[PDB]
Design an enzyme around this catalytic site. Structure first.
Site, mmCIF file in Angstrom:
data_model
loop_
_atom_site.group_PDB
_atom_site.id
_atom_site.type_symbol
_atom_site.label_atom_id
_atom_site.label_comp_id
_atom_site.label_asym_id
_atom_site.label_seq_id
_atom_site.Cartn_x
_atom_site.Cartn_y
_atom_site.Cartn_z
ATOM 1 N N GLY A 130 0.801 -1.225 0.000
ATOM 2 C CA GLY A 130 0.000 0.000 0.000
ATOM 3 C C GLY A 130 0.832 1.272 0.000
ATOM 4 O O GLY A 130 2.034 1.240 -0.274
ATOM 5 N N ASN A 131 0.187 2.396 0.303
ATOM 6 C CA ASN A 131 0.877 3.685 0.407
ATOM 7 C C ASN A 131 1.778 3.742 1.640
ATOM 8 O O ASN A 131 2.888 4.274 1.582
ATOM 9 C CB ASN A 131 -0.131 4.840 0.434
ATOM 10 N N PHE A 132 1.291 3.190 2.751
ATOM 11 C CA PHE A 132 2.085 3.046 3.978
ATOM 12 C C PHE A 132 3.408 2.316 3.720
ATOM 13 O O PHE A 132 4.431 2.638 4.327
ATOM 14 C CB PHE A 132 1.286 2.295 5.057
ATOM 15 N N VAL A 151 3.752 -5.005 4.182
ATOM 16 C CA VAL A 151 3.770 -5.806 5.395
ATOM 17 C C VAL A 151 4.355 -7.158 5.022
ATOM 18 O O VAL A 151 3.990 -7.730 3.991
ATOM 19 C CB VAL A 151 2.360 -6.019 5.992
ATOM 20 N N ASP A 174 -9.883 5.398 12.830
ATOM 21 C CA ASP A 174 -9.836 4.672 11.568
ATOM 22 C C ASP A 174 -10.428 3.269 11.692
ATOM 23 O O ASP A 174 -9.973 2.352 11.017
ATOM 24 C CB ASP A 174 -8.385 4.597 11.072
HETATM 25 C C1 0K1 Z 1 -3.513 -4.600 2.857
HETATM 26 N N1 0K1 Z 1 -3.396 -6.026 3.178
HETATM 27 C C2 0K1 Z 1 -2.806 -6.510 4.283
HETATM 28 C C3 0K1 Z 1 -2.887 -7.876 4.230
HETATM 29 C C4 0K1 Z 1 -2.398 -8.855 5.228
HETATM 30 C C5 0K1 Z 1 -2.310 -10.201 4.894
HETATM 31 C C6 0K1 Z 1 -1.868 -11.113 5.837
HETATM 32 C C7 0K1 Z 1 -1.521 -10.694 7.111
HETATM 33 C C8 0K1 Z 1 -1.596 -9.347 7.470
HETATM 34 C C9 0K1 Z 1 -1.244 -8.854 8.850
HETATM 35 C C10 0K1 Z 1 -1.000 -9.705 9.926
HETATM 36 N N2 0K1 Z 1 -0.712 -9.195 11.184
HETATM 37 C C11 0K1 Z 1 -0.650 -7.830 11.397
HETATM 38 N N3 0K1 Z 1 -0.348 -7.341 12.676
HETATM 39 C C12 0K1 Z 1 -0.880 -6.963 10.341
HETATM 40 C C13 0K1 Z 1 -0.858 -5.486 10.514
HETATM 41 O O1 0K1 Z 1 -0.644 -4.972 11.581
HETATM 42 N N4 0K1 Z 1 -1.135 -4.717 9.402
HETATM 43 C C14 0K1 Z 1 -1.225 -3.249 9.192
HETATM 44 C C15 0K1 Z 1 -2.692 -2.820 9.382
HETATM 45 C C16 0K1 Z 1 -2.834 -1.299 9.194
HETATM 46 C C17 0K1 Z 1 -2.374 -0.886 7.797
HETATM 47 C C18 0K1 Z 1 -0.901 -1.297 7.625
HETATM 48 C C19 0K1 Z 1 -0.768 -2.829 7.763
HETATM 49 C C20 0K1 Z 1 -1.646 -3.473 6.680
HETATM 50 C C21 0K1 Z 1 -3.131 -3.126 6.921
HETATM 51 O O2 0K1 Z 1 -3.942 -3.822 5.982
HETATM 52 C C22 0K1 Z 1 -3.275 -1.598 6.761
HETATM 53 C C23 0K1 Z 1 -3.582 -3.517 8.339
HETATM 54 N N5 0K1 Z 1 -1.188 -7.486 9.092
HETATM 55 C C24 0K1 Z 1 -2.050 -8.440 6.516
HETATM 56 C C25 0K1 Z 1 -3.557 -8.130 3.057
HETATM 57 N N6 0K1 Z 1 -3.830 -6.957 2.454
#
Ligand code: 0K1
Length: 269
Positions: free
Chosen positions: A18-20, A23, A127
């Site tokens: 993403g923009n951030f 991950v 958010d």
């Molecule tokens: C976009 N995306 C993300 C996935 C995706 C797919 C599999 C695992 C995770 C995952 C697992 N464990 C976490 N603690 C976080 C986690 O903390 N993620 C942050 C949150 C806040 C912002 C930045 C970042 C990704 C976001 O989606 C947006 C959630 N994210 C995220 C698929 N698609």
């Protein structure tokens, strides 16, 4: 607070972009066992946003909120967090439309428990959305994304935003749009939209509508319809979360208690 790069092991597979930034999955070697972690790798202004986020996360301890392990400075800045393997709630439900109402009620209740703690702690999330709720398992949800979050001053019960940045208007209560006032009851409005999303299996809310048209819709008293298969008691709770007047809108103690009773009454059958 500050992690040791030597002990951090990253995998080349990106989980999400993403923009951030991206991950990635990684392993942090602790005292005996290794722990699977999610690493937010930011791609001047960007540094302070992650440090501020990290300082917020450090203060919060709850089963229903993603915990921070720490921060690490390498080629990029890195925020290390607990891994929520199943990923965003909205994309999970989009790909698993056989998940039953009892299971969705459970997940949103867990979110109501996490937001109640946040409200008790006098933090506003700003958010809250299905995209920001992550699944550890199909029966265990965690709130994430604290990049817009604010610890309220000990004498104020709301936060006043100066800059009108890129706002997810469709999740924002009326007082956020018109007076830039963000309180825990503004998160309650967003939780209402999160419920609609959860029971609509990751459908976008107010589809095909610009943010100005949504405002006009809410101002006429109109509210999104009941999702197919959603029990009436949960839709009533959605509508209660979408109370225009912030004073008559409930806090998360009332919301969470409402969800607790209905869930246990749905169970036992
Ligand atoms: C976009 N995306 C993300 C996935 C995706 C797919 C599999 C695992 C995770 C995952 C697992 N464990 C976490 N603690 C976080 C986690 O903390 N993620 C942050 C949150 C806040 C912002 C930045 C970042 C990704 C976001 O989606 C947006 C959630 N994210 C995220 C698929 N698609």
């Amino acid at each position: 607070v500050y992690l040791d790069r030597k002990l951090l092991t990253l995998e080349d597979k990106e989980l999400g972009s993403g923009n951030f930034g991206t991950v990635k999955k990684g392993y942090y070697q602790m005292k005996k066992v290794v722990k699977t972690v999610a690493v937010k790798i930011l791609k001047p202004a960007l540094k302070d946003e992650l440090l501020a986020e990290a300082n917020v996360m450090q203060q919060l301890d709850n089963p229903y909120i993603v915990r921070m392990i720490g921060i690490c400075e390498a080629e990029s800045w890195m925020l290390v967090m607990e891994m929520a393997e199943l990923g965003p709630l909205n994309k999970y439900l989009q790909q698993n439309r056989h998940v039953k109402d009892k299971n969705i009620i459970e997940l949103v209740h867990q979110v109501s428990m996490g937001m109640k703690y946040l409200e008790e702690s006098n933090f506003v999330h700003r958010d809250l959305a299905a995209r920001n709720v992550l699944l550890v398992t199909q029966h265990y949800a965690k709130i994430s994304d604290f990049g817009l979050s604010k610890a309220l001053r000990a004498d104020e019960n709301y936060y006043k935003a100066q800059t009108h940045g890129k706002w997810p208007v469709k999740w924002y209560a009326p007082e956020c749009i018109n007076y830039y006032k963000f309180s825990s009851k503004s998160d309650v409005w967003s939780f209402g939209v999160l419920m609609w999303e959860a029971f609509s299996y990751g459908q976008k809310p107010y589809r095909g509508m610009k943010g100005s048209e949504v405002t006009a819709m809410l101002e006429k008293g109109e509210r999104m319809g009941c999702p197919a298969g959603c029990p009436r008691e949960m839709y009533d709770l959605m509508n209660l979360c979408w109370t225009y007047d912030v004073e008559n809108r409930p806090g998360f103690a009332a919301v969470e208690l409402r969800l607790r009773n209905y869930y246990y009454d749905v169970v036992n059958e």
